[PDB]
From Swiss-Prot, chain B:
CDD domains: Peptidase_M17
The record's free-text note on cofactor binding: Binds 2 manganese ions per subunit.
Pfam family, one: Peptidase_M17_N
Protein name stated in the entry: Cytosol aminopeptidase
Positions annotated to bind Mn(2+) 1: D246, D323, E325
Protein residues bound to Mn(2+) 2: K241, D246, D264, E325
One record GO biological process: proteolysis
Provenance organism: Helicobacter pylori (strain ATCC 700392 / 26695) (Campylobacter pylori)
EC number, as in UniProt: 3.4.11.1, 3.4.11.10
GO terms of molecular function: aminopeptidase activity; manganese ion binding; metalloaminopeptidase activity
Sequence similarity: Belongs to the peptidase M17 family.
Active site feature: K253, R327
First-tier enzyme category under EC: hydrolase
Ranges in a coiled coil: none
Curated annotation (Swiss-Prot), chain C:
One record GO biological process: proteolysis
Function: Presumably involved in the processing and regular turnover of intracellular proteins. Catalyzes the removal of unsubstituted N-terminal amino acids from various peptides.
Record-annotated active site: K257, R331
Catalyzed reaction equations: Release of an N-terminal amino acid, Xaa-|-Yaa-, in which Xaa is preferably Leu, but may be other amino acids including Pro although not Arg or Lys, and Yaa may be Pro. Amino acid amides and methyl esters are also readily hydrolyzed, but rates on arylamides are exceedingly low; Release of an N-terminal amino acid, preferentially leucine, but not glutamic or aspartic acids
UniProt xrefs under PROSITE patterns: CYTOSOL_AP
Swiss-Prot/TrEMBL keywords: Aminopeptidase, Cytoplasm, Hydrolase, Manganese, Metal-binding, Protease
Chief location category: cytoplasm
Enzyme type, top EC level: hydrolase
Binding residue positions for Mn(2+) 1: D250, D327, E329
Cofactor note: Binds 2 manganese ions per subunit.
Annotated GO MF terms: aminopeptidase activity; manganese ion binding; metalloaminopeptidase activity
SUPFAM superfamilies per UniProt: Macro domain-like, Zn-dependent exopeptidases
Name recorded for this polypeptide: Cytosol aminopeptidase
Length: 480, 479, 483
């Protein structure tokens, strides 16, 4: 809740309790650097932050003239000030290019306040409450206002997602996800449907139901369906999300080291809820459907099993060989329900595979699908939004590794290599021909939840997928 | 090899002891399908091969009208006929025309390859020739061009494959050098073969560290091939990991992961084959092939987790795992490569398991800074029939190879991003003035695979050779 | 080194390019807190350091009035100042809960230790501008004589510690057993000590086959060294033998260590290294005792000549040893070196070894284990050692543990038959090689935890700590007091 006040005034004349000045690429020459000697004395060379005490100026380093590094720096700056006693900070303006840099600056600043400290007995309300932005170029009023609108909506949407994903699993049940979705629907006047295991049975979503069987009597599943219907709809978009509120691996039980952080296996479903908040408040011209399959994957005497053969809603049978490959079962059924809506575009988000993380690192999501133009659009837009992405290619050799001797498809690969992609090729088996060129699969298993601070993300949930998909939709609608 | 004869005749008039007919996308309607009824009776629907016994016609299915699937079926067809009694097969011409003809002739030829040297039941094939009727399903010009590529590329691939398949007691660093010597003699190439004393003079201590355990058994070799044509539009350095065996070192591999490590020399072998291909194709570029050859063995002299190595470039390396040895060898070989002032540097290595986990066994990773250069390699490589993907660097991953007691650590602090942090390790040894001239290709996946797939027999594939050849040809076009 | 200058003046009139003031227990009331308002505005509440830029004052928090936290904070202050542009810092004299002498020692040693870091191989490494601390002889709450005594201790102990740390931090390709002998030779030359460096033939003649078995794998690459340093003062009240495990690298042998466990094994020479540093310290402190430093140096490598599970070795002492795991090699080298040590007929024998993983599992990374039979001797080492700033714990033998190192085909086994009590059963194994006439004169110190830690803690930088040197030094001094 960092308020940003835009003011038609010079940086020098603007009034706040302290000052923020960015040092881009180690350039200390600007007028705003009031006491350069002080920096020399204490050897500040532009890496990280430095507080001039006398002048009450916080300097924040930006290693290269780069919009993404500016976003990071702004976040680090406000993180720093949050611990101090200044109620307000003033900052000059740093910079299509102008709009993107103002978005980065304002979003950066606002995300600086976030941390998941709900359970800390020492949590303190920040004194820092406002950033005063002097509308004057470091090197317009229309752009600032637009950027500020984005920053407020995106900050709110990301923090919704981050709060949901960070919520511990005894609390963050499938029912709890549905409640978060209800608030978002009520806030934006959206249509929402919340289906239970009875609906799932009716629609023959037996893959989804299988995953939930261990825990049905404790925490029943929810299929959550949000709809944003605007005045003008240029496209119909289905966003499909894995809402595994806890994943212990089922009977194929995860080792202890790997079960921690599995409250974040609802990262994909949570991003979809945040995406409907963001896309509705931005008022995009598209009918957007947010579909979340929510359940735990627990172990117990009613668990689904290695050797079970499940009949998916689409009709294809699935040999289960490992119950820890559960996200793709839930997704198989949720994608089927999505396709019944006849959307122009389907994007699914999932913390699907460990192999993705092994391949791309913790900070980068994978993009899969058939339509290269579509995959490129999502990548380019996503990269610009500040998310790290990489396309991973299908091939015919990988496709063969998910065959089953006794079912239509196996829920794991016969090889220990290519897991993220064979997982995407599993999902493909349930994408109808007439949707294969309209479909994107985004595996956010890495950056959805990371146990350290990085970029604009505090320890834990990051809200991965939200910015990227928002940018993707906006660019898509520009062509439409 | 498979002799391919180009004849200006109709398919019908051409003569051979059997016929090969491709069935594209289940189209059985063509005149060359002599007896449709037979195929109906025996339920042949165009998947794989089917042999018309009376007419002596082998049908080979191509699932889609696709040049790469054609290359695959052509290989399967010859594999099938290799076990039969026909000395010759005739085939029509299938169709851009150039790539199709290249795919056809290459695929046909590769169908004969099997690593069967140590098999006691091996017989010589009866099949010697494919008669190609120059008739579509000038032409002769394109055909003669595709056949020249096919012959050079088959030869080049089989050089790489025989070398990679050679078991480690035989395929020593010295053995690699001898193979490189042969290629240089056949191609009138300049060649230098340096030993551990040269390494020592050049202060290539990361390289030497990996070899220390086994120095007294099989000494290391730095192999330097040079192709220098009449006209050189570019200077190109090709740099290969030549680990002729990798047991992991003191960080010993589990038994399950040590099998196939004779193929840790896949990158170095690719480079040897590339100089064969690029010299015989007569490309207008000066090409240097640089191969760092050694084993990574375990013993009382092995370099150790906790060793801190001074690279030739001068940066220090904290060793935390002796099974990340390839990047040490390459660190020094890249430094040697850069002294040559090349316009382009590409390295090939079977570098990381994480690459394989990430992309699957059939696909190589492309890393670097220059997007235009990576894109050229990717696009040309895919067209050559190799599977590739670009993997992106980022600033977060770069932090993971930091060391508290050296300039860089030879492993990442994270379990995640292995192939890429290995790429970022290599990057610390690429001078600023070469960072935009550099490609890193991780072929740990497709270099060696324990089954047949596409045009590849069990074992070595020759991965990297086709993709880099196409990359070079495309590159010189723009120069 | 950080030059310390003692000056007879007030803190205020002393001159330096910056000041250091400790803030104890969040009390900001002292006159040396020049601008108290500044600290409030920027929410400095006494945790860690805070720099008053305008006044050039570094505050360093000391959570309680405690001599050990003072030592830690001093170190932090100088670590912080090392990265700045000040050539000199001035500080006053602090007397926390120790006494004046121990507080002076803490302050001066902490300050000096703040400069250490193992950065030899770093390319970015730069010399620090910070060269001196000006100590103004004025109490925060004979002073000069005590300060001179504390300064000498801090000077000798800093030097001794950094010798151990440089040696332990040295990577294994370089830090061979021969390299260990060379460092010992330098120490000997510097201090005019007797030194003997025995090779594998001496080991052979003395029938030290446990020692030799460990070395067999790597004999042809790096021959072993038995290092024997001797400090002989005019007046010696006691003969003290210090015995150290000098495994310059331990890959585990044929019982190969997992990869994640083989890293840091350059530090398996921590015990031997501490003994080398201990002779430097004790000679320069001029202690009144004949001190022997015995170091068994070798690698424990894998190879075709490596000693094996099922090998049965005849120790120098005569007892046969069933080997069931080659990664329990330190106790074999120590069996033979302890035997050698007892041949000196010392009054006290202390061995130091990075001996067991179980010790670390038991006490944590920061604490050493003390074993032996003589409770009073054990207590002297513990108390002395704690006061010196090392963390320590006595671990008790018992008869049930002793049975677990029995062998069906030899006199003793080099591992226990149980997964439990590893550090203690290793100590009981050592005991089998301690003659009856030395059982009440023997201490075994397992420094497997603190000798090497992969982070900064207390006064120790990433890596080697020099664990054991401060503790043993204090123990010898206390011992000689009563003698
Ligand atoms: Na994650
Ligand atoms: Na492979
Ligand atoms: Na330790
Ligand atoms: Zn799972
Ligand atoms: Zn899951
Ligand atoms: Zn390796
Ligand atoms: Zn390797
Ligand atoms: Zn050991
Ligand atoms: Zn040891």
């Amino acid at each position: 809740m960092l308020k940003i006040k835009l003011e038609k005034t010079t940086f020098e004349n603007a009034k706040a309790e302290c000052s923020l000045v960015f040092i881009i690429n180690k350039d200390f020459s600007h007028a705003w650097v009031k006491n350069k000697e002080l920096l020399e004395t204490f050897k500040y060379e532009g890496e990280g932050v430095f507080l001039d005490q006398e002048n009450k100026i916080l300097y924040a380093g930006v290693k290269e003239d780069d919009v993404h590094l500016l976003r990071e720096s702004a976040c680090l700056a406000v993180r720093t000030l949050k611990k101090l006693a200044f109620k307000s900070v003033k900052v000059g303006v740093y910079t299509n290019a102008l709009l993107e840099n103002l978005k980065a600056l304002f979003l950066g600043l606002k995300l600086g306040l976030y941390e998941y400290d709900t359970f800390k007995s020492n949590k303190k309300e920040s004194v820092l409450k406002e950033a005063i932005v002097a509308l004057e170029l470091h090197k317009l009023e229309k752009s600032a206002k637009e950027a500020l609108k984005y920053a407020e909506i995106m900050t709110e949407s990301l923090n919704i997602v981050k709060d949901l994903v960070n919520t511990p699993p005894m609390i963050g049940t499938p029912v709890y996800m549905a409640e978060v979705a209800q608030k978002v629907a009520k806030e934006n006047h959206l249509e929402i449907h919340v289906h239970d295991e009875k609906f799932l049975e009716e629609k023959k979503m037996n893959a989804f139901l299988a995953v939930n069987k261990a825990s049905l009597s404790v925490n029943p599943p929810r299929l959550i369906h949000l709809v944003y219907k605007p005045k003008k709809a240029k496209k119909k978009i289905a966003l499909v999300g894995k809402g595994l509120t806890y994943d212990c691996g089922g009977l194929s039980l995860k080792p202890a080291d790997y079960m921690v952080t599995m409250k974040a296996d609802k990262g994909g479903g949570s991003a979809v809820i945040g995406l409907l908040n963001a896309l509705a408040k931005l008022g995009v011209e598209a009918e957007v459907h947010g579909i979340i399959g929510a359940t735990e994957n627990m172990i117990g005497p009613a668990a689904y099993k290695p050797d079970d053969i499940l009949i998916s809603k689409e009709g294809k049978s699935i040999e289960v060989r490992n119950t820890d490959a559960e996200g793709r079962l839930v997704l198989a059924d949720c994608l089927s329900y999505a396709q019944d809506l006849n959307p122009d575009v389907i994007v699914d988000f999932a913390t699907l595979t460990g192999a993705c993380v092994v391949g791309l690192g913790e900070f980068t999501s994978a993009i899969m699908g058939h339509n290269e133009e579509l995959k490129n659009l999502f990548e380019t837009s996503g990269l610009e939004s500040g998310e790290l992405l990489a396309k991973l290619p299908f091939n015919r050799h990988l496709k063969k590794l998910i065959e089953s001797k006794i079912a239509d498809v196996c829920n794991i690969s016969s090889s220990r290599y290519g897991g993220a992609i064979t997982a995407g090729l599993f999902l493909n088996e349930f994408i109808r021909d007439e949707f294969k060129d309209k479909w994107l699969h985004i595996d956010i298993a890495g950056p959805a939840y990371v146990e350290k601070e990085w970029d604009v993300n505090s320890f834990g949930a990051s809200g991965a997928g939200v910015r990227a998909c928002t940018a993707f939709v906006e660019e898509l609608l520009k062509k439409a």
